[PDB]
Amino acid sequence: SDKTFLENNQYTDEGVKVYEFIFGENYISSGGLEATKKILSDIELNENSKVLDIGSGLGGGCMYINEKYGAHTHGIDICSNIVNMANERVSGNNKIIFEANDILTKEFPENNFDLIYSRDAILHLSLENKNKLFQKCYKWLKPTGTLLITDYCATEKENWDDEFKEYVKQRKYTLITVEEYADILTACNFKNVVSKDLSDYWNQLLEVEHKYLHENKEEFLKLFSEKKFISLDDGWSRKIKDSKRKMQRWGYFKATKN
């Protein structure tokens, strides 16, 4: 059911291409390549490392991790159409694998990965499933491994306004506070749990993206439609407003198995 909802609405082929337009080639989330460089700036891996990317999208993250470190990267994404697109973006590289599957039913061996990485994907999971997923991640990490996440978070639900309630409802997101998120990781026995509210940085990424959209409107209209432009424009406007006033937050989380 989840698969069909995502494939048929938010992540249709065209929806994915619209995201790629504003985020940059191979990315469909916040800050594209430049944010990825920053998020991985203190991460150490090498050609012998094994990495899992949960919700791998068009595969940009896997491509970058493999380029930077030479690591084995395995991306899982529930949307078959997105995985098909990702597979067209990489060739002749036996250390990048993209696989269409629900991360919640996927099986991996215990103590398997040096890094489990996820960028703006876990918002799609119910609270019960976030907990289940992080339990799986704990098992799947090597003793020496690291968990590294960015995800959409929010102020406490009691504070939400009508527009924000509707945004979350229509997308079927489950947005929790940065603090609740960190508490889940702690409950799952992760160590050295570091959470950062990166909402200010996120706001900066959004502003750069918004400016890019405006300055490249003519090309956007040629590729897509004015209707799609307006939707995207308004969507970024709201994210900028809501991040500034702390209604919507961008959470970063890093933790270790030991």
Ligand X SMILES: Nc1ncnc2c1ncn2[C@@H]1O[C@H](C[C@@H](N)CC[C@H](N)C(=O)O)[C@@H](O)[C@H]1O
Q: Is 117 part of any known ligand binding site?
A: no
Q: Are strands 50-54 and 248-256 parallel, antiparallel or unpaired?
A: unpaired
Report whether 249 belongs to an annotated binding site. no
Q: Specify whether 11 is catalytic.
A: yes
Of 72, 74, 124, 210, the active-site residue reads: 124
Cβ contacts of residue 211 below 8 Å, gap of 6+?
none
Assess 209 for contact with ligand X (CB under 6 A). no
Sign of CA dihedral 129, 130, 134, 137: positive
Options 99-107, 153-161, 178-186, 191-199: segment touching ligand X (CB under 6 A)? 99-107
103 is in an annotated binding site: yes
With CB under 6 A as the contact rule, the residue among 15, 22, 29, 113 that binds ligand X is 29
Task: Return the residue of 27, 134, 190, 252 that touches ligand X, per CB under 6 A.
Answer: 27
Q: Is 214 a catalytic residue?
A: no
Residues 113-152 that bind ligand X (CB under 6 A): 119-121, 124
Alpha-carbon distance values, 6 to 70, 80, 121 (Å): 31, 10, 12
CA separation for the pair 40, 65 (Å, rounded): 8
Q: Which is nearer to ligand X, 11 or 160 (CB)?
A: 11
Binding residues for ligand X restricted to 63-82, rule: CB under 6 A: 76-79, 82
Q: Under the rule (CB under 6 A), what is the footprint of ligand X?
A: 6, 11, 27-29, 55-57, 60-61, 76-79, 82, 102-104, 119-121, 124
* Binding-site residue ranges for phosphoethanolamine: 10, 19, 152, 167, 171, 173, 239
Catalytic residues: 11, 124
